[PDB]
Write a protein that binds this DNA or RNA. Structure first.
Ligand SMILES: [Mg+2]
Ligand SMILES: [Mg+2]
Ligand SMILES: [Mg+2]
Ligand SMILES: [Mg+2]
Ligand SMILES: [Mg+2]
Ligand SMILES: [Zn+2]
Ligand SMILES: [Zn+2]
Ligand SMILES: [Zn+2]
Ligand SMILES: [Zn+2]
Ligand SMILES: [Zn+2]
Ligand SMILES: [Zn+2]
Lengths: 103, 103
DNA sequence: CCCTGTCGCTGAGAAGCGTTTGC
DNA sequence: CCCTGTCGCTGAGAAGCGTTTGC
């Protein structure tokens, strides 16, 4: 049931993705099929989300939406998309989501 | 892919299972379909194996064969089968298998 | 009134072939 | 010669709807 984690190279990042990076959490479009789930807010939406470049990462715990990465970690998804060494907060052990903060 | 853990009540234990409890690890019968995997020796065989009664347990980590439970923990599978409060060594945090001993 | 924001819950949390059997 | 025994490796290690959005 685990979704395979695929590292999208920075060269394959397209302008359409940056344009679709969410800037308002209430301006999201839900889609049970094409949407992606943000690890932080746990919403499956169609806005562009981060891609963890850590090979040891797995699943969707490396996927963060615009508002969540902006407000919970002070980082921009556009910068994370273009960063080839970017690691997700779960990989860095700094994730402050409701599940990761207790454990 | 996780096999559902089902608690078999002690009243439903049958004599055919005790007779099929393994007494020699080299006298096992491998079966990819009907066999069960012992958590300790990681062999999928048809001999009777333990059933963990802990509701919080999951998967097959509570399944131990005759020789493994006898030699690695000093307990008999027949006694474990008839014990309604029996917990697997992984549940007790005392498992000494090659994977559990390091972690 | 201002940096336009977030957690609960369920079900989830491997298994088994291969290279495997003591001093 | 005796209590008739065991580990490596791969792939595994959730996700997302619902009850969800700041002081
Ligand atoms: Mg699974
Ligand atoms: Mg569900
Ligand atoms: Mg379950
Ligand atoms: Mg395999
Ligand atoms: Mg894998
Ligand atoms: Zn989010
Ligand atoms: Zn990661
Ligand atoms: Zn987290
Ligand atoms: Zn065994
Ligand atoms: Zn157990
Ligand atoms: Zn173990």
């Amino acid at each position: 049931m685990t979704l395979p984690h695929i590292i999208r190279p920075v060269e394959e990042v397209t302008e359409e993705e940056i344009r679709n990076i969410c800037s308002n959490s209430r301006e999201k479009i839900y889609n049970r099929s094409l949407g992606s789930t943000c690890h932080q807010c746990r919403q499956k939406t169609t806005d562009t989300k981060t891609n963890c470049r850590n090979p040891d990462c797995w699943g969707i715990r490396g996927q963060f939406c615009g508002p969540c990465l902006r407000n919970r970690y002070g980082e921009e998804v556009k910068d994370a998309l273009l960063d080839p060494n970017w690691h997700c907060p779960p990989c860095r052990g700094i994730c402050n989501c409701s599940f990761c903060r207790q454990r």
